[PDB]
Amino acid sequence: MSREEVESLIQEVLEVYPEKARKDRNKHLAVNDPAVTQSKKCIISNKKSQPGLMTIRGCAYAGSKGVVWGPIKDMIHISHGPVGCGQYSRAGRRNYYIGTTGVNAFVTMNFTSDFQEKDIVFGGDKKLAKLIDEVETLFPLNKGISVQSECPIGLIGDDIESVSKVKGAELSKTIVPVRCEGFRGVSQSLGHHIANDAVRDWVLGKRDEDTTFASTPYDVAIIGDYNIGGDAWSSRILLEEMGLRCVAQWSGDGSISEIELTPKVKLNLVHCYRSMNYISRHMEEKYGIPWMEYNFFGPTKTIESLRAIAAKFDESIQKKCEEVIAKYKPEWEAVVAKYRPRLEGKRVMLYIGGLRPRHVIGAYEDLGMEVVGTGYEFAHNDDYDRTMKEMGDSTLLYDDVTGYEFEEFVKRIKPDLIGSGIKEKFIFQKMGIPFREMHSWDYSGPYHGFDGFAIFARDMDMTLNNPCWKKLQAPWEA
Amino acid sequence: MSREEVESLIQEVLEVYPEKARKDRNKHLAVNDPAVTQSKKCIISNKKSQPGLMTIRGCAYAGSKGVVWGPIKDMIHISHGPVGCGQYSRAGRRNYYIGTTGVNAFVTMNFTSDFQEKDIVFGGDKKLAKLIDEVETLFPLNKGISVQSECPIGLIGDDIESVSKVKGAELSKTIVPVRCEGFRGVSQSLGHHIANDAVRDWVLGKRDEDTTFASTPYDVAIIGDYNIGGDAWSSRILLEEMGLRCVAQWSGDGSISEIELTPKVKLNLVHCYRSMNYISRHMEEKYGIPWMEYNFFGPTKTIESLRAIAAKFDESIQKKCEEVIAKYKPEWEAVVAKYRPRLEGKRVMLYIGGLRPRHVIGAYEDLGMEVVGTGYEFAHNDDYDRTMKEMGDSTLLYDDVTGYEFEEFVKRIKPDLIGSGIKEKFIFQKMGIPFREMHSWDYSGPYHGFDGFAIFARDMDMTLNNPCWKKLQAPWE
Amino acid sequence: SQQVDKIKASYPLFLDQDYKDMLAKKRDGFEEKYPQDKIDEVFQWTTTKEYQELNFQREALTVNPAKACQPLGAVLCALGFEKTMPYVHGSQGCVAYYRSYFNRHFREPVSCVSDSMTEDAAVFGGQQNMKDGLQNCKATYKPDMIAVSTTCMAEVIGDDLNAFINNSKKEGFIPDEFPVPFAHTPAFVGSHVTGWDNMFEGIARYFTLKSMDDKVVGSNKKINIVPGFETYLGNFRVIKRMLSEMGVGYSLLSDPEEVLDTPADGQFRMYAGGTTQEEMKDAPNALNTVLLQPWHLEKTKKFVEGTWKHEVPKLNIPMGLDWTDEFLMKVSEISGQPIPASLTKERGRLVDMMTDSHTWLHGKRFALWGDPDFVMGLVKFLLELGCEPVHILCHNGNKRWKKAVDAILAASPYGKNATVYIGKDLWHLRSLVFTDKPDFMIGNSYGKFIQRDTLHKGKEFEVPLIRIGFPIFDRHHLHRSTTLGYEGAMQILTTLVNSILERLDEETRGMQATDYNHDLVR
Amino acid sequence: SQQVDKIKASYPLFLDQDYKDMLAKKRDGFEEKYPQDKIDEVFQWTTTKEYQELNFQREALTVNPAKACQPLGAVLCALGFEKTMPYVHGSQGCVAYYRSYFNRHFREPVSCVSDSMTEDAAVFGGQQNMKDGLQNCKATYKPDMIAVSTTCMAEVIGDDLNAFINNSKKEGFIPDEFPVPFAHTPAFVGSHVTGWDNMFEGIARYFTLKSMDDKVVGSNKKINIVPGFETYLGNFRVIKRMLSEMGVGYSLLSDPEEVLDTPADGQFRMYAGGTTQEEMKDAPNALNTVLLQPWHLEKTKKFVEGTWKHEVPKLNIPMGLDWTDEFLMKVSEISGQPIPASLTKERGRLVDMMTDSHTWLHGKRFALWGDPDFVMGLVKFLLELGCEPVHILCHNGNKRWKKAVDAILAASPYGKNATVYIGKDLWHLRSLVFTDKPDFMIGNSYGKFIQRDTLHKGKEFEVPLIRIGFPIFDRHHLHRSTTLGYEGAMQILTTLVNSILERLDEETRGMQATDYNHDLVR
Numbered sequence A: 001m002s003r004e005e006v007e008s009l010i011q012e013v014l015e016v017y018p019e020k021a022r023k024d025r026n027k028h029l030a031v032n033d034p035a036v037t038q039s040k041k042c043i044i045s046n047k048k049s050q051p052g053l054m055t056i057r058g059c060a061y062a063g064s065k066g067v068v069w070g071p072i073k074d075m076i077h078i079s080h081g082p083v084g085c086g087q088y089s090r091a092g093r094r095n096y097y098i099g100t101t102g103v104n105a106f107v108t109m110n111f112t113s114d115f116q117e118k119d120i121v122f123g124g125d126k127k128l129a130k131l132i133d134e135v136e137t138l139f140p141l142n143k144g145i146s147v148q149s150e151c152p153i154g155l156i157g158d159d160i161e162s163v164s165k166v167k168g169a170e171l172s173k174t175i176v177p178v179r180c181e182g183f184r185g186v187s188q189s190l191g192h193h194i195a196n197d198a199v200r201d202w203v204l205g206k207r208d209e210d211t212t213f214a215s216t217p218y219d220v221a222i223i224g225d226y227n228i229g230g231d232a233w234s235s236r237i238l239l240e241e242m243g244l245r246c247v248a249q250w251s252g253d254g255s256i257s258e259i260e261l262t263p264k265v266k267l268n269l270v271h272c273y274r275s276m277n278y279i280s281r282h283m284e285e286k287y288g289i290p291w292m293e294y295n296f297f298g299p300t301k302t303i304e305s306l307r308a309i310a311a312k313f314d315e316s317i318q319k320k321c322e323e324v325i326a327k328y329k330p331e332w333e334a335v336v337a338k339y340r341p342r343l344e345g346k347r348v349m350l351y352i353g354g355l356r357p358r359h360v361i362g363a364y365e366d367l368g369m370e371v372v373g374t375g376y377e378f379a380h381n382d383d384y385d386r387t388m389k390e391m392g393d394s395t396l397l398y399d400d401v402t403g404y405e406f407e408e409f410v411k412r413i414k415p416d417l418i419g420s421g422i423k424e425k426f427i428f429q430k431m432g433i434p435f436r437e438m439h440s441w442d443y444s445g446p447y448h449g450f451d452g453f454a455i456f457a458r459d460m461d462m463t464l465n466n467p468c469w470k471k472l473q474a475p476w477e478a
Numbered sequence B: 001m002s003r004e005e006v007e008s009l010i011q012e013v014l015e016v017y018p019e020k021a022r023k024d025r026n027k028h029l030a031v032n033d034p035a036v037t038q039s040k041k042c043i044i045s046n047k048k049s050q051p052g053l054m055t056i057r058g059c060a061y062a063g064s065k066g067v068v069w070g071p072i073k074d075m076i077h078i079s080h081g082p083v084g085c086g087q088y089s090r091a092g093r094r095n096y097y098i099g100t101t102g103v104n105a106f107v108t109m110n111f112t113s114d115f116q117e118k119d120i121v122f123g124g125d126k127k128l129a130k131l132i133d134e135v136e137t138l139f140p141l142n143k144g145i146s147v148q149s150e151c152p153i154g155l156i157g158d159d160i161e162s163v164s165k166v167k168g169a170e171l172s173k174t175i176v177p178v179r180c181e182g183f184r185g186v187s188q189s190l191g192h193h194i195a196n197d198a199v200r201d202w203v204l205g206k207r208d209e210d211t212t213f214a215s216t217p218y219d220v221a222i223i224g225d226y227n228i229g230g231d232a233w234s235s236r237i238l239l240e241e242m243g244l245r246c247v248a249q250w251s252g253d254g255s256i257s258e259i260e261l262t263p264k265v266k267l268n269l270v271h272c273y274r275s276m277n278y279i280s281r282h283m284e285e286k287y288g289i290p291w292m293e294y295n296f297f298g299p300t301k302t303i304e305s306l307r308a309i310a311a312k313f314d315e316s317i318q319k320k321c322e323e324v325i326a327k328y329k330p331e332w333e334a335v336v337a338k339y340r341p342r343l344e345g346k347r348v349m350l351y352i353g354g355l356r357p358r359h360v361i362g363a364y365e366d367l368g369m370e371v372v373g374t375g376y377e378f379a380h381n382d383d384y385d386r387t388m389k390e391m392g393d394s395t396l397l398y399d400d401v402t403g404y405e406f407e408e409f410v411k412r413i414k415p416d417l418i419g420s421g422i423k424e425k426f427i428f429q430k431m432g433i434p435f436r437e438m439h440s441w442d443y444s445g446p447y448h449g450f451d452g453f454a455i456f457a458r459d460m461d462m463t464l465n466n467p468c469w470k471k472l473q474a475p476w477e
Numbered sequence C, D: 001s002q003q004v005d006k007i008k009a010s011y012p013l014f015l016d017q018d019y020k021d022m023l024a025k026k027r028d029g030f031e032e033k034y035p036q037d038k039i040d041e042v043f044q045w046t047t048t049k050e051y052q053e054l055n056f057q058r059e060a061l062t063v064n065p066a067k068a069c070q071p072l073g074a075v076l077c078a079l080g081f082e083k084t085m086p087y088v089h090g091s092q093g094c095v096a097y098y099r100s101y102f103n104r105h106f107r108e109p110v111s112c113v114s115d116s117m118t119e120d121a122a123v124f125g126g127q128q129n130m131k132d133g134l135q136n137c138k139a140t141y142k143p144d145m146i147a148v149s150t151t152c153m154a155e156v157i158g159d160d161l162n163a164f165i166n167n168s169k170k171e172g173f174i175p176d177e178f179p180v181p182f183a184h185t186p187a188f189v190g191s192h193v194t195g196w197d198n199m200f201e202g203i204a205r206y207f208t209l210k211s212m213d214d215k216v217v218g219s220n221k222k223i224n225i226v227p228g229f230e231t232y233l234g235n236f237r238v239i240k241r242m243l244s245e246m247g248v249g250y251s252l253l254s255d256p257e258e259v260l261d262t263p264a265d266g267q268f269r270m271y272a273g274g275t276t277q278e279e280m281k282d283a284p285n286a287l288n289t290v291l292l293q294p295w296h297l298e299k300t301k302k303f304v305e306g307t308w309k310h311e312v313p314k315l316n317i318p319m320g321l322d323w324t325d326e327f328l329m330k331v332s333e334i335s336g337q338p339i340p341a342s343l344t345k346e347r348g349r350l351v352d353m354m355t356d357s358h359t360w361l362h363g364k365r366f367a368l369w370g371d372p373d374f375v376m377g378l379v380k381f382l383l384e385l386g387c388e389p390v391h392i393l394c395h396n397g398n399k400r401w402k403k404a405v406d407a408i409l410a411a412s413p414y415g416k417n418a419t420v421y422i423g424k425d426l427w428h429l430r431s432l433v434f435t436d437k438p439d440f441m442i443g444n445s446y447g448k449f450i451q452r453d454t455l456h457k458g459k460e461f462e463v464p465l466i467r468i469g470f471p472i473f474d475r476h477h478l479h480r481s482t483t484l485g486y487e488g489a490m491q492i493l494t495t496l497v498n499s500i501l502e503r504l505d506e507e508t509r510g511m512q513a514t515d516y517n518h519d520l521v522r
């Protein structure tokens, strides 16, 4: 629990590694210190994973197709390459949407070019052109196509940009080539960046010359909310109760037209900084639109965000802000009265992707819980900068944790709850440690906003206090 | 099998019995002879079962509550006695009806007085009166109550007639006491009779002097169709296509008001003679209503019955009769064209209750099948008279067959199909003999009429020619 | 009309227009039916708390009971003994019903005879029926044993079974050494499970009462297992499997699993397997006797303790995690055998499934009914799963049992909203699921009519039935399932969680309306 | 808004009026959505035969495939060996997906490593990744064996696994005696089942190719069993149980049942059970080798016959009655053991169930998909039940396989209306179940979207899904089921008949409309 204990634990765990891996991993493990503010002085991140150590990371295709582009509901997204990637990622992420699937929405479908060896030998560019025509025949109400490149596309020298330009002009359709081959970068993170640049270069500027949109001083866009279990809807409802007009959601429940309308808004509200700071910076440079980070996890952060957002407008919005806060106050106070006593003092370890490892700490603290360890699969140093302010002193920080490290840290720290992903869940349940999936919300949620806090609290309580955890040891064993 | 072969089988099977049972059972087994028409000269029936031989028969309560009264849909029927009888018979018989169950119809519910030992000691008559009031408060849209007596009621000296008269007057409600205790009679059959007499004494005469109902010359009643899987509906549609007006159905999908209107009809159409000839005889004596037997199993019998029924009216009905026959001719001809080749020559043994063991023979023959044995649980000799004209020469006849006898007959005769009840079904399937339930229709049907013939043929084909029968023997033995 | 290429059965045949019009005319013409608005009004009233209070004031009327009469259980018990014919002294209508009831649940032959007492026996008794019945039965169906119970007619008239059987032997109707155990099984006392207890105790007494003097407790090194009224084949098989895995010597007393599951191989086997007469004769020499369903084996317990001198352990039915744990630990203590690694691993696999599924089970509200031991075991396991058993109905329960269940409920937070009902039927339960709606019912096939009623009020008020219990008539082969032990807990957990997920999939299947939550992964 | 005592998740939270109004405003304001009448017109068009004709003209576009890529099968094969770590040479994203895919089906940990090749390795190869990866893996996770396959990156650039592994040993990154079998598993060839075959053949070669000269066929008196790509735990267990019941000595080569079902007892077990290296080294001394799924074990067969000199029997997958019979009889001939009475009785119980249920199964029409062996076994069993498999889809099937299935269909009257499809996906199948509607689909969780589509046309057009196959993500613990042998046939039969009866209950639940056929007894 003490700093010195945690640092020795780090060295003990690293003793199993070969020399090269030991030296590398030592740079990705650290203990928080309130006297050090810059992560550029205590932890390394966004480097390649060491071979053979069972990283939890994915690839750039996951970050582009699975995360950024896939949720866009009225476009068709082509997993261009062999059959695997699109199949493993079919409907795995709960980026919720409203639509008629197969007719005007396509999110949970898997479109693919199903590369065979002939496509490896001759290239897949002619197949792609034929594929686009077939999509247009069978799915006439699609409003655009994206081509998500899997590993072989770049390795065999295909030119999907040329196909996209030619067929796009021929069909008068938006066709977005995305070079998100899984071997690029070190993780999902570069997929975000690649995908953001594809939005910029092929979609975002379509309406630069249009003056048709009827704007208001209260137009905003939600940037970097993928509506996991409806998260973006339970965020959107608050913003519009506060008097704002949410023109676009990037990209949960998102349409291509919303994307094209975003350059017309007055303020970009960035929830997931990691995945969307790139395009937000672009829109501030090209269109002069300011952007700001916010946090809708738990009442404390939601109230703080509402007031910071409202401060960017006029008195009428700031007044409505306090109306919204007062409206929901009895509701989240009833949640705290019920569940905080059932959770207070319990210690949590988190391991997630690029945002939630820090963003959910406030919600846990609103239930009296303590986050004693956290870490990211693919965060950068600016993320860890923001993390040091949120985490408590002497808490454990881990970047791109290995399966071995995570298991060994948990054994010693003995957290009451772990929040991580599907590949971690069943390991720790077998150890008798309550587990909550903090990507998929364990098929629950939403967790954003006031309505999501109630579900979050219910969910932590039902798992932490469940009768099953008292039964791991057979009574004759002892 | 030859006649002499069948007679030797009977003697072979009877050798296992003790002397007393052997002499008795010999009287209930016979081989049909075209020179012998009167059953009283070749087989006995409607006598007590021999103890311990595993008869298939039920009791008088089954014949009254389960068969005659239970289907009446807007009445509440009280299984008066301990909890068992009403539970085992709850929704076991598929006497179909249209209604809102628990509100205005009650057929598949089980109402009971659930006798405890106190009720045995002090009697159940005060409990019955209290029960009736509770029925009235909780089921206000019921249009009458019946009290179906289980075994203990008569043995302890209860007087349900008195409770029924007193409570009936107090509440201005029809309350029918039925003395169908299971120890009465020898089978379900006496339950039919008791129930017929309860209808006559407590319901049928309510509208004797009433003249409100506007009659027509084409008013008929379907007597003795309990609408198993909808059988009565597929019969009614034909009678009404022929221009008749079916005022009542006794008692499948039957209402108490329909029963009360039956004395107003011009002709009683009796399907099940066994269970309803009593009340049919009564209505002809008291109201002058003629009755006639008919048979809607298979196209040959249905056509014959429609024409015989129409002959009782005028030319306009006889003309509509031929219209109905011509309408359905292509339909049942397509059924035989499809299924007769798949079934022709196959031999069938039947064992059912009091009507179907003879009534379905025509439908089997319409598919080219042969009924080589048949018998009844509880038929009387007039039923067997009708059976010998329907059955072929040298066929086997068995009354109140024992489990042992039926199994042994089947082993020697080796029928291709057996049609019997739930207590027989799983025995013969294990022997590798296709089996069709001929009470419940194996949860299929209807089988009556032209529409039912299509389902009947489909069902016999699916079971007789099913791939499962080729697999009983492991290839290594 | 029928199209030969697509023949219609009753459903959907009678939805054709001509059948619809015919039925409308029949209704309007002759049924004198209440107007539909009046039916809707009365129906709505039957779903209210006001109706519920009237419903629960019933004293004389029973509607839709959830129990049967004693001889049904006596027949099932007797079927568990080798080459034994159940024999019910009294009226034959009863036996037709017993056989039919079990035929439909097991989809198997069920052998049972009657001696066909009629009106006349009510005057002079059933002695002659017994003499001829026993001789006829023994000669025709060649059983090694005839186990005699009674119908309510024979109870009311007072036939002395012991005397009648002794006279049948004396007068030469059956050999003196042929075993004819008996029990009085009055339908107006208790229920079908009482009949099992009475029959079993009668059989135990027949084979042991007069030979105790050479018996020594523990001399055969076995444990007797008395299963009680049991209608899942897997429950007989899992107990034998677990004890064999432990290397524990055991005798299962009343074991019908073979005769209720004979192969279809071209011959009918009237008898198969079963407890032998020797196992009954030798049962007093066991180390102890375990009763798997003690809340309806009271009479058996008194005999086993009073006569065999076994110290029957205080064990609940081995259902769920805790009570299976306790059963194995007591078997280990009695037998001196350790719990093997295979059963320890099975336990941990059940716990693993509980952790895997706990988020969909948590807080789920249930109405349930059945026999006492089954019900309380289901209650216990639901509480272990984090479910709330809100309506607990046992028609044939008693005050002492209700107190035990109330103590189990009080020991857990998940029992806070639960009520236990004894002497109430399924018409009482219908009101409860309307006025205090649960998420699901757990019960037998009679529950399908409650689900139908709830749906008529509205899709949002429908309470789906999960079929666990007896009788199950409208699905096939669920009698092969298991509810005891870790195996049974695994099966029940799987059925519950997947019933929940099937219902959620139904509710989210609406395109562009609710299918935002039609998740591929759950 | 939320009421704390009845908290709503997304469903039904977002049906509240204020969310509904918000979502309508989002749509109308900014989504530029096609009008609903246009959506309905296009949807109706997608259900027509004209759409089907265009759909089946596809050559380049695949929509909703029903297959995965080779390394998935290589990983599953590798997991079946004792203390073996699957190792996929190539990019790490692949391994994240493989692990997650199996995590969701088995609800168990799935251990697999990558050596994380990136842009740099794409130009100069992954040799350094292999050297460090193997060393890191062995030191950190301490496997007894590392089984190496490839992602599509490593195949395209042409990394020589054999050379890279030999150099890792030569340069001291792992001990030379440490076993590192390998197989090339290109995602653009075949499917996940091909990866299983390739991996298994790689492991078999590693342990036997260079030591054949001391081998004598039949000298260890056992039969080898190769299960192939198998995702039902019960299928491993039933094969072992049947062979043990026969007293047949056997070696199950690739046995993941333990590592995919570890207990939750307070410790995580990365490895458990599995085929030992000794058993692989000794396999050539077996009497013969039986392939449980020969249509994706082609390469394994060539090695077992060409190198081990076993005369692999020509046996179909042991699914259903005939093919289980044939399996046991062939095992009996090879081993000299008779088929014991217990298996004969189990066979007869399956036949009994078939006779009990045949009237509800007869003529039922099914659409189904899966891997080739599974599909053809399901087809065979359906024909034995008297069902009609009208739409038979195997995305990863081939022409030789389709001819075999067509011959199976031709041998039965119940195959008259059946068509077999190879290389078609579930968007093809969607059209078929609209234009030639079956009664049910049998398939994996991806079929739930087709059931959703059919319901949108109308309740009378809905085709319910019966979940049998891989992956199953939206129900819990069905991976514990069995589909092989008599036990598997019994499970499938029960699922089918009760799916039929649940749907009939749904269609007849309407009070005073269709509940005339809502029978208590079925």
Ligand code: ICS
Pocket (backbone or CB within 6 Å): A063, A067, A093, A188, A226, A228, A272, A274, A275, A352, A353, A354, A355, A356, A357, A438, A439, A440
């Ligand atoms: S996009 Fe990112 S891994 Fe910001 S790739 Fe990942 S739906 Fe995570 S911590 Mo899955 S940077 Fe979103 C994420 Fe966070 S898929 Fe979701 S939960 S807030």
Ligand code: ICS
Pocket (backbone or CB within 6 Å): B063, B067, B093, B188, B226, B228, B272, B273, B274, B275, B352, B353, B354, B355, B356, B357, B438, B439, B440
């Ligand atoms: S009433 Fe009779 S036993 Fe005539 S008691 Fe029985 S619904 Fe049978 S042969 Mo079950 S005299 Fe009806 C009968 Fe026939 S119950 Fe049904 S099928 S035509």
Ligand SMILES: [Fe+3]
Pocket (backbone or CB within 6 Å): B426, C106, C107, C108, D352, D353, D356
């Ligand atoms: Fe059976």
Ligand SMILES: [Fe+3]
Pocket (backbone or CB within 6 Å): A426, C352, C353, C356, D106, D107, D108
């Ligand atoms: Fe698990």
